[model samples]
Target: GTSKLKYVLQDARFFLIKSNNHENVSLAKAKGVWSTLPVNEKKLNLAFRSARSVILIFSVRESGKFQGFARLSSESHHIHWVLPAGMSAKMLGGVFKIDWICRRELPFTKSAHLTNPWNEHKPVKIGRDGQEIELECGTQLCLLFPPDESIDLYQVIHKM
Candidate 1:
């Protein structure tokens, strides 16, 4: 038997700050809590004072593995495999949506999985300071932020 796999990387910039503060950030119920970085003095200082914006890079593997790399407060947090790509958000239904201050269960269908796989999954609430906006997906989706509309980090750094 042959298996065909298609991997699509969707970049979504969630302006957490723009989202309703009162609303909870949801995840899968079976997956358990999402991981997060420590809110120590150093971290808080960078998150609030120093950093202009935090970039979250989500890498979804074809093997159904998923992970998120966050550059927050000059610190990087790796929230791995909160949910396997093999299971569509549609399959999980409403459980996949944000809930409980960003706490929910992620159901892993694969049996005999590792315990404490990497680290604890911590749910992060977006502060009112900045918003996360999706920029691009390697030409997959439309570029929401134009150069003239707003400052493009890629262009500012000469990366674009």
Candidate 2:
């Protein structure tokens, strides 16, 4: 936790966007969401869903600060993991000096909306079944790592 959050009202947002899943918690048990683990170690072990959408705060398992945030959309027409990036699945990094004001955003694709982007780097490959770079995001899910920088995803999850 940052001293910025050593003691703060950080969760003020929860009131507008969190759920206990108490209703599904039991269902998740029945579904055996925790049924198994990757033969490797199964660190990416978690699963949850919101009725409309969900936001996953990624981090190293067993805990510490989060790796990043990923948002699932139920409103946007065609976007998954539509947080700040996810436009470019490969190259990304830290936060921005100041958020580039925009009316919309984009996701990973060969094409783009507004020509030119903020930056470009390397491809952070997502973890795979037996690959060297896959992330064990959850029991039924695994993902590529998000860019280290937050806005960096802008080029990745390109925009319009």
Candidate 3:
């Protein structure tokens, strides 16, 4: 049977862009897109989609204030996990940081149009599995961003 998964918005992490005020536009575009995906496909896609290097704010099992940010990325889309400094793995789960390549340049056009109100800041949160338990902060969460290799997903993750 298919069931709808519940997720929370920890905080929008953006690079050289102001995403707080653009929630409506971002959420609207992000909505319904995930629900339409098939179950098996959802997990695979979510894992692959989240593989990009970036900082994330998550609450493990929906508890405590956002406990620091961790660096996350997929080595080759086969494994997903957190990359702690020199350590790299196919899968990493935890708070991580997404190093911004374009420090002075705004990654998103919307962000540039907004006058770059917020500097690039990594959002931190717990990274956990939701399929095992409901109401988990990091459970069943996915990063939504435009699929453009040139757009810099790390920046989008920050903004979202």
Candidate 4:
């Protein structure tokens, strides 16, 4: 029960199998700060603001999936930060590991429901290397990732 990567505060939603228009229905508050993503490394600017269903989200690490990449909303490019999903295989079989830098200062959650964190989590696909681009929320997402991991990806490249 301890894979470390903890920060708790997880409320990710966008359950809409297909867009009927209306930005899905407002539900974007995946993490705090509202904004910040230039590059001093203060890092913490995920997006989903105003609470509407702009569904679809992804985070990749490879091998077994789930690693780290939730930093996007520095202004507009969704990723922002929400790391959760067991990360302990001797901490990725570290051998030549050397390099680290982190930051934190939590305090934001009046609403956006940060708690039902995918129950077990599994909805990655948006391309690159591991073939995980299956719709991974990093590039382009429509069904909000098939109602959030119910998965049923289909799009002629979003009409090329």
Top candidate on TM-score is 3
Off by over 4 Å in 4: 1-10, 14-47, 51-62, 69-71, 77-160
For each candidate in turn, the TM-score is: 0.19, 0.19, 0.20, 0.19
Better of 1 and 2 by lDDT: 1
lDDT against the true structure, each candidate: 0.24, 0.21, 0.25, 0.22
Give lDDT tens digits, candidate 2, residues 29-137. Answer: 2331211113211222111122221233222222222233333221221111122222232221211111111112122231122121111212221222212221211
lDDT of 3 by residue, 18-93 (tens): 1112322133223311111133223433543553322232222223322222223322221122223554332222
Residue ranges of candidate 3 with Cα displaced over 4 Å? 1-53, 75-160
Tens-digit per-residue lDDT, 47-112, candidate 1: 434333333322222222113222232232221223343533332222111111111112222211
Candidate 2 lDDT at 138 equals 22
lDDT of 2 at 36: 12
Cα lDDT of model 3 overall? 0.25
C-alpha RMSD between model 2 and the true structure: 18.8
Window of ten residues with lowest summed lDDT in model 2: 9-18
By lDDT, who's the top model here?
Answer: 3
Q: What is the TM-score (0 to 1) of candidate 3?
A: 0.20
